[PDB]
Design a protein around this ligand. Sequence first.
Ligand SMILES: Nc1nc2c(ncn2[C@@H]2O[C@H](COP(=O)(O)OP(=O)(O)NP(=O)(O)O)[C@@H](O)[C@H]2O)c(=O)[nH]1
Ligand SMILES: [Mg+2]
Length: 165
Amino acid sequence: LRKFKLVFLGEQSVGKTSLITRFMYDSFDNTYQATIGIDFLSKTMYLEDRTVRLQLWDTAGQERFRSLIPSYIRDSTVAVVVYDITNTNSFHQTSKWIDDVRTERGSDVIIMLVGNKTDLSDKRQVSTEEGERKAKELNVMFIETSAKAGYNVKQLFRRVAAALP
Ligand SMILES: Nc1nc2c(ncn2[C@@H]2O[C@H](COP(=O)(O)OP(=O)(O)NP(=O)(O)O)[C@@H](O)[C@H]2O)c(=O)[nH]1
Ligand SMILES: [Mg+2]
């Protein structure tokens, strides 16, 4: 089968896992269950009217697990790097995650920068335009989402899939 190989990266608590579960299961939980190490989903699905093997690695944002991540980045055609629009540190820290992807794959990768939690726009600390500007500077795609609301979650996956050969 064709593969659709993604890795989710980003600081702790930004909503990596929640994006994945909203997409795959239409499921969201307010309760925080930290990802420990690297979790994995492999599923045969239909993409754009073809059978595709999804291989999705969901990494922990905690620094203590970061040493595990390079081999998973190496095997991933798509890297999804997530931040929380309410947390400026999480936004600036996307740089190291993108650098980690470049270290392993150079330009031979699709990267999507995601500003998540737009349902919390009252608490927004990073503008949409700041995100767009950073993405363009780094030569990566950009989207804003809300895993909680189910906003732009399917679109995230559609857009990275559309970039696959
Ligand atoms: N309001 C709101 N909360 C969200 C959103 N996405 C995730 N959360 C919340 O933020 C917390 C962390 O979410 P989670 O998906 O576990 O984040 P993660 O990036 O996978 N964390 P880790 O790196 O620890 O695995 C949870 O309490 C979850 O409910 C969102 O779009 N909006
Ligand atoms: Mg997680």
